Amino acid sequence: ALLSFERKYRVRGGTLIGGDLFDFWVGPYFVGFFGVSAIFFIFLGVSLIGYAASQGPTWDPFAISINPPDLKYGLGAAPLLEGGFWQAITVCALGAFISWMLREVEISRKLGIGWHVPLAFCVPIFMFCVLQVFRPLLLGSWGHAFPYGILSHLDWVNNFGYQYLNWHYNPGHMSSVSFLFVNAMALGLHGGLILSVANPGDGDKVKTAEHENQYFRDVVGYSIGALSIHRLGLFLASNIFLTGAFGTIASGPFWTRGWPEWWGWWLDIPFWS
Amino acid sequence: CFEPPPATTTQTGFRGLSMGEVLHPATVKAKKERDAQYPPALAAVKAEGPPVSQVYKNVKVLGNLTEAEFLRTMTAITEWVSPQEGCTYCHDENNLASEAKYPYVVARRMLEMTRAINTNWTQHVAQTGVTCYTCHRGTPLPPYVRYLEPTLPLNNRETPTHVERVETRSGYVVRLAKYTAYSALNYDPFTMFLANDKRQVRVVPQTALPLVGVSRGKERRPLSDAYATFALMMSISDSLGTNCTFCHNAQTFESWGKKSTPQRAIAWWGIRMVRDLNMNYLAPLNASLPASRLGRQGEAPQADCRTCHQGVTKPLFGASRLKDYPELGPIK
Amino acid sequence: MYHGALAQHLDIAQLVWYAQWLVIWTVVLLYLRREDRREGYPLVEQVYELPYPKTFVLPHGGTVTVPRRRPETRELKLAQTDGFEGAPLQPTGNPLVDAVGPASYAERAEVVDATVDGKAKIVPLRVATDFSIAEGDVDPRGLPVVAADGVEAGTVTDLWVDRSEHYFRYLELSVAGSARTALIPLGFCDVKKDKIVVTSILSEQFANVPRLQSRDQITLREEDKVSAYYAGGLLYATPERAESLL
Amino acid sequence: ADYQTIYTQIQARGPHITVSGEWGDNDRVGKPFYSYWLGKIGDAQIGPIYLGASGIAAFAFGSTAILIILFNMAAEVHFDPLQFFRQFFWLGLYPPKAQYGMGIPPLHDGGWWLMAGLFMTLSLGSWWIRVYSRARALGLGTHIAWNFAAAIFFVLCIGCIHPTLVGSWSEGVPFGIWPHIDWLTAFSIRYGNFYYCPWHGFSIGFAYGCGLLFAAHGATILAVARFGGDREIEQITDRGTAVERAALFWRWTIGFNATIESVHRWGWFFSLMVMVSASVGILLTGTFVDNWYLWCVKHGAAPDYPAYLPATPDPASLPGAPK
Ligand code: BCB
Ligand code: BCB
Ligand code: BCB
Ligand SMILES: C/C=C1/c2cc3[nH]c4c(c3C)C(=O)[C@H](C(=O)OC)c4c3nc(cc4[nH]c(cc(n2)[C@@H]1C)c(C(C)=O)c4C)[C@@H](C)[C@@H]3CCC(=O)OC/C=C(\C)CCC[C@H](C)CCC[C@@H](C)CCCC(C)C
Ligand SMILES: C/C=C1/c2cc3[nH]c4c(c3C)C(=O)[C@H](C(=O)OC)c4c3nc(cc4[nH]c(cc(n2)[C@@H]1C)c(C(C)=O)c4C)[C@@H](C)[C@@H]3CCC(=O)OC/C=C(\C)CCC[C@H](C)CCC[C@@H](C)CCCC(C)C
Ligand SMILES: CC(C)=CCC/C(C)=C\CC/C(C)=C/CC/C(C)=C/CC/C(C)=C/CC/C(C)=C/CC/C(C)=C/CC/C(C)=C/CC/C(C)=C/CC1=C(C)C(=O)c2ccccc2C1=O
Ligand code: HEC
Ligand code: HEC
Ligand code: HEC
Ligand code: HEC
Ligand SMILES: CC(C)=CCC/C(C)=C/C=C/C(C)=C/C=C/C(C)=C/C=C\C=C(C)\C=C\C=C(/C)CC/C=C(/C)CCCC(C)C
Ligand SMILES: COC1=C(OC)C(=O)C(C/C=C(\C)CCC=C(C)C)=C(C)C1=O
Ligand SMILES: CCCCCCCCCCCC[N+](C)(C)[O-]
Ligand SMILES: [Fe+2]
Q1: What are the structural domain ranges in chain C?
Q2: Which residue of A2, A59, B19, B67 pairs with B245 in a disulfide if CB–CB is 3.0 to 4.6 A?
Q3: Any idea which positions bind heme 3 (chain B)?
């Protein structure tokens, strides 16, 4: 149940809490304190989903939807059926995600590698907090958060967009979408380039770093380099949400009109009006 | 380029659908102050005497009123429409029955029109109704009217720039944009949907699968119809100072039942009302108005949603004078 | 009402829906997951879903077949403390020198990584005389190397440049109180204007940095040995680094 | 902290490397020049660039398309240069507003749009030959060209194939900043909410997946840069501790792992499937599905919600209702 090269890496150490007590594996999975922590919040969360589902109409997993409370309840607590389940499940989700991130730190430390992955994984946790915690706080109600259902969450995104008439004109969104597109393209390019060098076809020889740099210098007149494309990729992916967050938070608390009208700052300058 | 919190929020759909209004309190406050200028009703008067239909010589609409009531209607009408020029805006002092001044014949048609809103379009105006003031706001020219081409500013009491003037061809895209809530949509929804009843606002098929005989080549409506409907909805939204979720669950714009709010059904009646006003009362006044009031195609100024609403979901925040002025309707 | 009826009139979009899921699960389970198992499989301490070994034709002659049969040589340097498969293993000696846990190197080939035109790729600036430090950056030659304990451990003698990518990958330093140089990867180096800070290991541990067979070139296995030593230090330079932080 | 994962502390300079290809060596133009500031976060060298016929053909065809677009945009503000700069984002070149079916539209109502599209397509096709042929010239696989081909196929679907299949040029995407964006809503509305198109779902899953995968992969390689993880080619042919540690990090976290080669196949597949899934969705739209929301209702896949404000009957359906 070990990879051929794995045994030599399976030493004690690198935990943040508990020392030797949780320093072990179940099959391929490292445990650690944050492993135990994660499994607690996951077990609690999935149970509350099951309990909520049992009170609702259906057992169809694609129709299940645990929704936040009506706006009336503000930042207060709500009856379980009427949004309380939603509040409990959000706390378990945060618990599970933060546990998962800190478990990645323990694994990083045991292997003596950089902490870059758990750091990168903080970006989507932040964005979840912007949608479910920071934005609802600034508007004064948990009711502004998105519901936990596979299809119902799309209806929330849809209505949220159309509350600002045309969400495409949101400057934070324009940035976010630009990073999503260039990131998807760059992964294609990076993945394609590596495969092109290691698999040239027809029992021909594997090529070189020099071939990689030459290919892109020929095609676009620049090659960023092998290390730098990995740093760039983390940059492009991360900025999908780091720029997006400002467009989401701005919508309601810092802007109440349609997003097209925002561009009035430019269009309505007196000297060309 | 930003509006400081807090924001006022309402809920128009099931919790978790992100449906409802988003309002800046300073903006709501400024519109409330503007609309608080609605003059108060004049003191009620006892119906003492005979009907003016056999006292005065040229009363074709308000003939049932007694002298004291009729003079009250005339004092209200004057406050609402021409408070600066007074009774002589419409009247020759030497003969109060003279139709010699152009505003007189127009005022009569406007009494007919106001009574028809309050009687035939209750599905839209309910028991709030309208007075002259709803549209006119104390000036003979109502501040928010439409010609058969887009004009800026929206408020005709504001002075146009060189580029806003309809004659400057280079400002056309901006005249269109500021009528569609700053969108780039390349359609005039007033001329297309509100001037008359030629075009259908609905574009979304009511079948899952494409119906044979309306779905290929020249039998299909062009995509431009979807854009145009979108432009009407941007215009209607800005005119009422609201967003799509006031009327729709965006899940299905085309669906009624739980997928639409009662305000959407009222908006539907509003579209029919505006078309009636324009086709049967406002467009035909080009024969009765001076050249200085007409557009470049010889059209009379006409009404859209903003003419009454002026950026509020209910005109003047629901202020009524219906029970104060029953002669403006309804009329059984 | 009929037993076995579903409330579903079939249309082409419905057909293409099932087809798409089929294509996705086929590519993921039967191709991508098969490619994922080319290294470290078969498992030790199942076979029917492994692909046939892949052969690469190398740039400078020869072939390699993956997975390589080269065995793992650190087996006796760790002991099964406990009967439970999941329990961590105990080092038998100094894990930093024995090269286990985060001090582990891979059984990489004892060949000099080469440029496209057959020269050694990673060489000191005393050999690559056509290479320089860019105008504006710190020439670290002559500067002291400060270890974790604040002690000066040696002096920088050279930089090793990657001739293929035009990128410095190692510093060479004279080790104070020995006749030897050591390599350190730039990744373990804080380059200040008046010193190189190394938090990875204590000053005394620069003595046992793996030695190069040759003075002016390095093999792929040697690169791994040098790099792994410093990473070993993150957990083993002091006894309290292997212990939990909080 | 590995400061090298943030920037290059000490930059190297050396002689300009050139790898010879089977053809085209003489079509490389420019003197390479180095940028100290670029060299902090990437390679310092800018240029030279390969020209060739496909390069020049692409630039010529592309420029024609841009010129046609810019001239129609200048026409829309009647060649006032200050209004042009002001209104730029709002300006566009539109497909036909009227229904001419597949009839070639007149210049004033879609003909220019159709010409701009033809030149854009010939530009893309030329650039594809460049991306493919440069790979073959250097003895590299054509993986990039096939990823690029899926991207081009998607542009052909929204620009040309969908309009052809339903038989109207009116359905094409306008040229312009705001106008190309406005099309997204007009199209979603016409076809009953793209959230309810399963191929929109797939395409988004793969796009979000590209974010997850490049963040994870980018972060993983920086995490093992100390061990030369960035030298991905020789880690494929000769597994080092870099990719052993990378594999075990993921195996211990999620319970399974890729190889340094196979993770690039995951990346390439996810990227490709954004464009393939999107293309299938457009091909089905209007041809075989008119309203995605009602299609989901028909297959029992659309959620329902309680009333909050009262259910509102369609006024058009009431007895005595006007048209
Ligand atoms: C009508 C509605 C519109 C709309 C409304 C909209 C809104 C309201 C918001 C966006 C946002 C965004 N939109 Mg957008 N949109 C986008 C693209 C995007 C995204 C790039 C961006 C960020 C998404 C996000 O927050 O994920 C969030 C994902 C998260 C937080 C995932 C967290 C993962 C978690 C940590 C881990 C969970 C683990 C699992 C539970 C584990 C399961 C266990 C299993 C696996 C074993 C495109 C490309 C388009 C196109 C082509 O038109 C578009 C159109 C529209 N959007 C419409 C115009 N959009 C967001 C944004 O940034 O706007 C500025 C945003 O708030
Ligand atoms: C601001 C905008 C948002 C948005 C807008 C959005 C759109 C527009 C679309 C989706 C879609 C999806 N979203 Mg959603 N979303 C989802 C999850 C999902 C999936 C059900 C699906 C595919 C995502 C994917 O492949 O990503 C990449 C990740 C990959 C490839 C790794 C595998 C992830 C795995 C498939 C996730 C499975 C989640 C579980 C079913 C739920 C949790 C299970 C628990 C109870 C054990 C989560 C878990 C979250 C959280 C926790 O924040 C989230 C937040 C948001 N989404 C924001 C609210 N999302 C698509 C869909 O088809 O929905 C029907 C879709 O079209
Ligand atoms: C209200 C409107 C909506 C909408 C309408 C919409 C439509 C109409 C379509 C999409 C499509 C898609 N949407 Mg979607 N959308 C998306 C995400 C996405 C994309 C993943 C996907 C594919 C498009 C793409 O990658 O283009 C980016 C990549 C492109 C365009 C490839 C370009 C390649 C080309 C070779 C580049 C050439 C460059 C040259 C240099 C150019 C030179 C030009 C010169 C000469 C003039 C998200 C994440 C959300 C959220 C979070 O809400 C969302 C909401 C919405 N979308 C709303 C529901 N969306 C597409 C799809 O999947 O449909 C099924 C699509 O057709
Ligand atoms: C810009 C940066 C990008 C980014 C980056 C990274 N992403 C990472 C990492 C990095 C670096 C990791 O290192 C980590 C990982 O391990 O990789 C394999 C990870 C992961 N990214 C996942 C999902 C994911 N990433 C998304 C987005 C981005 N990622 C953006 C694009 C999206 C969407 C929607 O886009 C999804 C769905 C998981 C697979 C995994 C966490 C598992 C977990 O935390 O387990 C712990 C938790 C569970 C196993 C279940 C918890 C169940 C709770 C308690 C109850 C239900 C909660 C409720 C919210 C349900 C609502 C459902 C409803 C909406 C339908
Ligand atoms: C999921 C798959 C993704 C994907 C994939 C892939 N995408 C690729 C490839 C792959 C595999 C390539 O192999 C190829 C390439 O070469 O990569 C370096 C390429 C391309 N993707 C570009 C743009 C893009 N991809 C987008 C989207 C996705 N891509 C999706 C997300 C989007 C969005 C989101 O809107 C945009 C804007 C161009 C840079 C390039 C075409 C150049 C061209 O066809 O020129 C033809 C036109 C000209 C040469 C015009 C002349 C120039 C004038 C003066 C105006 C300047 C314009 C300038 C931008 C042109 C660049 C020239 C310069 C380099 C000297
Ligand atoms: C004995 C036994 C087997 C028991 C099992 C029973 C069981 C289920 C649980 C045990 C019970 C206990 C006590 C548990 C404690 C341990 C514990 C905390 C377990 C957690 C269980 C759990 C929650 C599991 C779910 C894990 C999870 C979040 C999985 C999601 C997988 C998904 C969807 C991934 C998305 C990303 C994706 C598409 C990846 C595919 C490609 C891969 C693998 C990329 C990762 C990757 C990258 C990114 C590289 O760059 C790379 C570079 C060089 C080499 C390798 C890699 C590499 O592998
Ligand atoms: C235009 C806005 C008017 C203003 C301002 C005033 N009046 Fe008027 N008046 C107007 C009309 C259209 C009519 C005909 C009404 C109808 O039912 O057809 C009238 C009528 C009169 C009369 C009756 C005169 C007669 O026919 O003999 C009187 C006495 C009268 N109006 C008086 C009056 C006064 C005193 C006003 C200022 C307070 C005033 N009118 C304003 C139109 C308009
Ligand atoms: C909106 C639905 C209106 C209501 C209610 C009333 N009026 Fe009106 N009026 C309206 C328009 C769009 C116009 C055309 C523009 C114009 O200024 O001509 C008018 C016109 C008049 C006029 C002529 C004004 C002029 O040109 O000098 C008069 C005298 C007038 N309207 C009077 C009037 C009265 C008395 C009303 C209540 C009974 C009334 N109007 C209602 C729009 C609307
Ligand atoms: C009430 C004040 C509304 C607001 C705000 C918005 N819409 Fe609307 N919409 C409304 C009505 C009454 C109608 C039907 C008009 C008719 O004559 O039948 C519509 C129609 C649409 C449609 C077309 C639906 C169809 O069946 O084809 C769409 C696509 C639509 N509306 C969208 C939309 C958007 C995006 C809005 C915010 C910008 C919006 N509407 C606002 C009523 C109201
Ligand atoms: C003056 C003649 C009007 C015109 C033109 C339009 N509307 Fe209107 N609207 C008017 C009144 C007097 C009222 C009643 C306010 C009340 O207290 O009942 C309304 C009401 C609405 C509503 C309902 C708002 C709510 O319930 O909060 C909507 C949604 C509405 N109106 C929309 C609407 C549209 C879309 C119009 C143009 C097509 C339009 N109205 C024109 C008066 C007048
Ligand atoms: C069958 C017959 C007879 C003929 C067939 C013709 C044919 C195949 C036509 C095909 C047409 C097609 C595929 C059209 C597609 C159009 C599309 C997808 C347009 C999309 C986006 C347009 C955008 C973003 C336009 C932007 C315009 C500008 C920025 C103005 C140009 C100015 C610049 C400075 C260059 C912009 C470069 C950009 C990357 C920023
Ligand atoms: C080892 O891998 C890689 C390189 O090293 C030799 C590159 O040089 C490039 C090319 C990167 C460039 C031209 C940066 C410009 C921006 C984008 C989005 C491509 C890619 C894709 C890559 O994968
Ligand atoms: C690569 C993983 C992506 C998985 C996301 C799910 C895509 C299929 C969507 C089907 C259900 C959505 N809808 C609304 C069309 O029914
Ligand atoms: Fe890589």
Answers
A1: 2-107, 108-246
A2: B19
A3: 233, 244, 247-248
| Neighboring chain A residues of B9 at a CB cutoff of 8 Å | 71, 139-141, 144, 252
Q: Tell me the residue range of the domain where A246 lies.
A: 161-272
Separation between Cα atoms, residue B134 and residue B129, nearest integer Å: 9
Calpha distance A86→A142 (Å, rounded): 9
Please name the residue ranges forming H helices in B278-320. 305-309
- Against chain C, the chains showing at least 3 CB pairs within 8 Å are A, D
Residue D315 located in a structural domain: no
D288 with D161, same domain: the answer is yes
D39–C58 C-beta distance less than 8 A: no
Domain of D36, in residue numbers? 1-143
For D:112-131, CB contacts with A below 8 A are: 130-131
Do A110 and A125 sit in the same domain of this protein?
A: yes
Interface of C with A in 60-119 (CB under 8 A): 67, 72, 74-75, 77-78, 84-91, 95, 100-104, 106-107, 115-116
Are both D18 and D156 inside the same structural domain?
no
Taking the Cβ of residue D238 and every Cβ of chain C, the question of whether any pair is shorter than 8 Å is answered with yes
Cβ atoms of A232 and D50 within 8 Å: the answer is no
Beta strands in C108-238 (DSSP E): 122-124, 132-133, 144-146, 152-162, 167-175, 181-185, 190-191, 196-197
Touching A (3+ Cβ pairs <8 A), the chains are B, C, D
What φ, ψ does residue C44 adopt, rounded to 5°? -125, 160
Spatial separation of the C-alpha atoms in residues D145 and D133, rounded to whole Å: 9
Number of domains in chain A: 2
Distance CA C216, CA C158 (A): 11
A116 is in an annotated binding site: no
Place of tokens 């996705």: C24
Task: Write down the CATH number for the domain with range B145-314.
Answer: 1.10.468.10
Whether residue A116 sits in one domain with residue A34:
yes
CATH topology of domain C2-107: Photosynthetic Reaction Center; Chain H, domain 1 (4.10.540)
Contacts of C69 (CB under 8 A, 6+ apart): none
Residue D231 CB neighbours (<10 A) = 28
Token pair for residue B44?
């009620």
Q: How was this structure determined?
A: X-ray
- The count of CB pairs under 8 A between chains A and D is 289
Q: Is the dihedral of CA A270, B1, B4, B8 positive or negative?
A: positive
Ligand 2, CB cutoff 6 Å, lining residues: A 46, 49, 128, 131, 146, 150-151, 153-154, 157; D 200-201, 204-205, 208-209, 212
Subunit contact B18:A152, Cβ cutoff 8 A: no
- Residue reference for tokens 């498969």: C85
Task: Tally the domains of chain D.
Answer: 2
Task: Give CA–CA dist C172/C185, Å, rounded.
Answer: 9
- Chain A interface disruption, residue of D143, D173, D188, D304, most A CBs within 10 A: D143
* Beta pairing partners, C120: C114
Residue D238 is part of a domain; what is its CATH number? Answer: 1.20.85.10
Ligand 3 pocket, residue D187 CB under 6 Å: yes
Longest dimension (CA), chain B: 72
Placement of tokens 């929020």 in the chain:
B9
Per the structure block, which two tokens stand in for C229? 């030593």
Nearest to B70 by CA among B50, B95, B91: B50
Given CATH 1.20.1050.10, say whether it is the number of domain C108-246: no
Domain B1-144+315-332: top CATH class: mainly alpha
C16 CB within 8 Å of a chain A CB: no
In units of Å, what resolution does this entry have? 2.2
Q: What is the rounded CA–CA span in Å between residue B256 and residue D142?
A: 52
CATH number at residue A73: 1.20.85.10
Round to whole Å and give the CA distance between A124 and A130.
10
